[PDB]
Enzyme design. Structure first.
Site, PDB file in Angstrom:
ATOM      1  N   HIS A 240       0.850  -1.181   0.000  1.00 26.85           N
ATOM      2  CA  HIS A 240       0.000   0.000   0.000  1.00 26.85           C
ATOM      3  C   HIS A 240       0.893   1.239   0.000  1.00 26.85           C
ATOM      4  O   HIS A 240       1.855   1.320   0.757  1.00 26.85           O
ATOM      5  CB  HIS A 240      -0.848  -0.047   1.270  1.00 26.85           C
ATOM      6  CG  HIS A 240      -1.851   1.063   1.416  1.00 26.85           C
ATOM      7  ND1 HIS A 240      -2.935   1.213   0.574  1.00 26.85           N
ATOM      8  CD2 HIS A 240      -1.958   2.050   2.345  1.00 26.85           C
ATOM      9  CE1 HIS A 240      -3.659   2.252   0.965  1.00 26.85           C
ATOM     10  NE2 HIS A 240      -3.077   2.789   2.025  1.00 26.85           N
ATOM     11  N   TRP A 266      -5.839   6.277   2.715  1.00 29.16           N
ATOM     12  CA  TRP A 266      -7.188   6.005   3.203  1.00 29.16           C
ATOM     13  C   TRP A 266      -7.753   7.152   4.042  1.00 29.16           C
ATOM     14  O   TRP A 266      -8.955   7.280   4.181  1.00 29.16           O
ATOM     15  CB  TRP A 266      -7.203   4.712   4.047  1.00 29.16           C
ATOM     16  CG  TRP A 266      -6.935   3.452   3.303  1.00 29.16           C
ATOM     17  CD1 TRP A 266      -6.819   3.301   1.953  1.00 29.16           C
ATOM     18  CD2 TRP A 266      -6.813   2.138   3.863  1.00 29.16           C
ATOM     19  NE1 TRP A 266      -6.604   1.990   1.647  1.00 29.16           N
ATOM     20  CE2 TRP A 266      -6.595   1.253   2.801  1.00 29.16           C
ATOM     21  CE3 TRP A 266      -6.856   1.629   5.173  1.00 29.16           C
ATOM     22  CZ2 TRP A 266      -6.408  -0.134   2.994  1.00 29.16           C
ATOM     23  CZ3 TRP A 266      -6.683   0.267   5.369  1.00 29.16           C
ATOM     24  CH2 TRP A 266      -6.475  -0.603   4.298  1.00 29.16           C
TER      25      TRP A 266
HETATM   26  C1  NQI Z   1      -2.836   0.566  -3.834  1.00 21.02           C
HETATM   27  C2  NQI Z   1      -4.122   0.433  -3.013  1.00 21.02           C
HETATM   28  O1  NQI Z   1      -5.150   0.929  -3.472  1.00 21.02           O
HETATM   29  O2  NQI Z   1      -4.162  -0.169  -1.777  1.00 21.02           O
HETATM   30  C3  NQI Z   1      -5.585  -0.597  -1.541  1.00 21.02           C
HETATM   31  C4  NQI Z   1      -6.414   0.212  -0.538  1.00 21.02           C
HETATM   32  C5  NQI Z   1      -2.046  -0.747  -3.944  1.00 21.02           C
HETATM   33  O3  NQI Z   1      -2.891  -1.831  -4.356  1.00 21.02           O
HETATM   34  C6  NQI Z   1      -0.925  -0.605  -4.975  1.00 21.02           C
HETATM   35  O4  NQI Z   1      -1.165  -0.322  -6.149  1.00 21.02           O
HETATM   36  N1  NQI Z   1       0.300  -0.826  -4.502  1.00 21.02           N
HETATM   37  C7  NQI Z   1       1.481  -0.769  -5.382  1.00 21.02           C
HETATM   38  C8  NQI Z   1       2.612   0.101  -4.831  1.00 21.02           C
HETATM   39  C9  NQI Z   1       2.251   0.872  -3.745  1.00 21.02           C
HETATM   40  C10 NQI Z   1       2.998   0.734  -2.599  1.00 21.02           C
HETATM   41  C11 NQI Z   1       2.028  -2.178  -5.500  1.00 21.02           C
HETATM   42  O5  NQI Z   1       2.600  -2.645  -4.518  1.00 21.02           O
HETATM   43  N2  NQI Z   1       1.905  -2.869  -6.650  1.00 21.02           N
HETATM   44  C12 NQI Z   1       1.241  -2.518  -7.925  1.00 21.02           C
HETATM   45  C13 NQI Z   1       2.296  -2.071  -8.982  1.00 21.02           C
HETATM   46  C14 NQI Z   1       3.028  -3.196  -9.729  1.00 21.02           C
HETATM   47  C15 NQI Z   1       2.854  -3.024 -11.250  1.00 21.02           C
HETATM   48  N3  NQI Z   1       3.081  -4.308 -11.959  1.00 21.02           N
HETATM   49  C16 NQI Z   1       4.297  -4.675 -12.415  1.00 21.02           C
HETATM   50  N4  NQI Z   1       5.369  -3.888 -12.246  1.00 21.02           N
HETATM   51  N5  NQI Z   1       4.453  -5.838 -13.046  1.00 21.02           N
HETATM   52  C17 NQI Z   1       0.337  -3.753  -8.304  1.00 21.02           C
HETATM   53  O6  NQI Z   1      -0.044  -4.506  -7.391  1.00 21.02           O
HETATM   54  N6  NQI Z   1       0.010  -3.937  -9.607  1.00 21.02           N
HETATM   55  C18 NQI Z   1      -0.843  -5.057 -10.153  1.00 21.02           C
HETATM   56  C19 NQI Z   1      -0.375  -6.490  -9.739  1.00 21.02           C
HETATM   57  C20 NQI Z   1      -0.573  -7.569 -10.836  1.00 21.02           C
HETATM   58  C21 NQI Z   1       0.197  -7.721 -11.923  1.00 21.02           C
HETATM   59  N7  NQI Z   1      -0.242  -8.754 -12.659  1.00 21.02           N
HETATM   60  C22 NQI Z   1      -1.311  -9.302 -12.073  1.00 21.02           C
HETATM   61  C23 NQI Z   1      -2.130 -10.387 -12.426  1.00 21.02           C
HETATM   62  C24 NQI Z   1      -3.203 -10.743 -11.602  1.00 21.02           C
HETATM   63  C25 NQI Z   1      -3.454 -10.018 -10.425  1.00 21.02           C
HETATM   64  C26 NQI Z   1      -2.633  -8.936 -10.071  1.00 21.02           C
HETATM   65  C27 NQI Z   1      -1.554  -8.573 -10.896  1.00 21.02           C
HETATM   66  C28 NQI Z   1      -2.341  -4.877  -9.787  1.00 21.02           C
HETATM   67  N8  NQI Z   1      -3.165  -4.776 -10.837  1.00 21.02           N
HETATM   68  O7  NQI Z   1      -2.720  -4.845  -8.614  1.00 21.02           O
END
Ligand code: NQI
Ligand code: CA
Ligand code: CA
Length: 322
Positions: A240, A266
């Protein structure tokens, strides 16, 4: 002058709507399910089904674009995984100059109102003007996505909608990288720090960045998958984005202690360890520091010692302005 996203011309559209006696409806990002999303927010989804598009002027008697400043408390995430974007907007508000580049002055729900607003973003290697109509997703009269703690305030909701627009839809925002939002607000240079390998001068780096009005945010990478819960034992949220909002030193029992202030986008759910709003640590700093720094409020924002911050979090991102 910012170049017009898609040739859409804010002032021309506004003056023509006012002349024609109508409120703007955005052909480029219309008030229909496709602007919400495609899967989770698709036309055949539970989430979409409850949603009605309403203008703040249909919701309230006195909607306001900005109330008591465009400030970080105006950024309270709704039901969308766009924490990374909201963390950047909250960080943005600490730098008044770059804030009001992204959020043009002189926009309102009164004189000259025609149901259209605009924002500037760094997109496609250009500073771009983006228009929106002020139709917003609502459910039972309440905004579904971002809202302010000030319930009659709409700038952050409209900015989030303009950011959705450039990305195709609200759903397109569900999951991302804070630094990506930082760049879209600045055209600046992003770097990140691996906190389990923090350089020994990291606190000075954060201090200087905050002083120059750089944007900073932080996160705890979920390493296993989520198999010790999404919320840690001391009330932090893993995977997050949080905004880093201050760094100040306090004198704790005659000893300097480096503190860092962060905000859960949040607008609630705070750290419960040392230096949290209700912690004992504050009993032991001089009364003047305690009153300047501690705010006892469930607002998403809290202090941690720098020592505890680097143990708990895994990643700091900093966007430096050029
Ligand atoms: C933000 C949030 O709203 O918290 C909920 C209240 C939070 O979900 C978020 O986006 N956090 C990101 C960074 C913030 C600290 C995070 O940790 N990850 C995202 C960025 C990664 C981008 N992808 C990449 N470099 N390959 C993230 O979670 N992205 C996606 C994850 C993902 C990728 N492929 C997927 C397939 C299936 C399910 C999920 C998948 C995403 N869409 O969540
Ligand atoms: Ca405000
Ligand atoms: Ca708090």
């Amino acid at each position: 002058n910012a170049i017009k996203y898609l040739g859409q011309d804010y002032e021309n559209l506004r003056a023509r709507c006012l002349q024609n006696g109508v409120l703007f409806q955005d052909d480029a990002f219309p008030p229909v399910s496709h602007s919400l999303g495609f899967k989770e927010l698709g036309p055949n989804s539970s989430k979409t089904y409850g949603i009605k598009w309403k203008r703040p002027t249909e919701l309230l008697s006195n909607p306001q674009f900005i109330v008591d400043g465009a400030t970080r408390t105006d950024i309270c995430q709704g039901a969308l995984g766009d924490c990374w974007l909201l963390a950047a907007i909250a960080s943005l508000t600490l730098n008044e100059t770059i804030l009001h580049r992204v959020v043009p002055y002189g926009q309102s729900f009164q004189e000259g109102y025609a149901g259209i607003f605009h924002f500037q973003l760094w997109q496609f290697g250009e500073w771009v003007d983006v228009v929106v109509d002020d139709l917003l997703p609502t459910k039972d009269g309440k905004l579904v996505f971002v809202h302010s703690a000030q319930g009659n305030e709409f700038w952050s909701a409209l900015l989030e909608k303009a950011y959705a627009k450039v990305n195709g839809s609200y759903e397109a925002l569900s999951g991302g990288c804070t630094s990506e939002a930082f760049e879209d607000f600045t055209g600046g240079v992003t770097e990140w720090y691996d906190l389990q390998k923090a350089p020994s001068d990291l606190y000075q780096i954060i201090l200087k960045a905050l002083e120059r009005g750089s944007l900073l945010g932080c996160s705890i990478n979920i390493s296993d998958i989520r198999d010790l819960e999404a919320i840690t034992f001391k009330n932090l949220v893993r995977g997050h984005a949080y905004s880093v909002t201050d760094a100040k030193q306090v004198t704790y029992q005659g000893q300097r202690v480096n503190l860092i202030r962060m905000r859960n986008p949040w607008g609630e759910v705070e750290w419960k360890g040392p230096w949290s709003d209700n912690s004992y640590e504050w009993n032991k700093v001089d009364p003047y520091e305690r009153e300047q720094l501690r705010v006892k409020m469930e607002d998403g924002e809290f202090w941690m010692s720098f020592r505890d911050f680097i143990r708990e979090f895994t990643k700091l991102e900093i966007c430096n302005l050029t």
